[PDB]
């Protein structure tokens, strides 16, 4: 059964961030998922995104996909972003989140899988469906991202439009 709830989402915050010194698109993140150590994630946001908004960001971040190196940089889970060709925006958890924090669906209950299988382009089958409210909130297919007891994630101005 192909739905959201397959996906590992957690907040976490960006410790650090720095530019990777061979890709100037790139960004190289350490981040608290709330684990014993934290997560290394590269992203691709230094053409929209200063690095003084990197860093003690508050991100919601797709866990259970497998490690990739990126450019010589093993990256251990994904920023969720809403996008489009003009803009980028950072989801962003409701306030009162902390690293570890799990967001559910309402409709959609179930155990993330271990480790999505790339063979199976699972988050390939998932995404698309993924994009935020005419109120900005993140849904799968209209169901808002919810941490229990907290509240949505939204982005900031992007309405309407993908996840990535």
Known sequence: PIDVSRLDLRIGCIITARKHPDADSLYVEE????????????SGLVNHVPLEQM????????????????????????????????????????????PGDRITFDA???????????????????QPDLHTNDECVATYKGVPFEVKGKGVCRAQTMSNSGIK
Do not use: H, Y
């Open 31 to 42: 981040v608290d998922v709330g684990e014993i150590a934290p997560r290394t994630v590269v």
């Open 55 to 98: 860093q003690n960001r508050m991100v919601i971040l797709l866990c259970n996909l497998k490690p990739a190196k990126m450019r010589g940089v093993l990256s251990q889970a994904m920023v969720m972003c809403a996008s489009s060709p003009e803009k980028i925006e950072i989801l962003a958890p409701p306030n009162g989140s902390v």
């Open 108 to 126: 959609f209950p179930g155990e993330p899988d271990k480790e999505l299988n790339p063979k199976k382009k699972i988050w390939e089958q998932i």
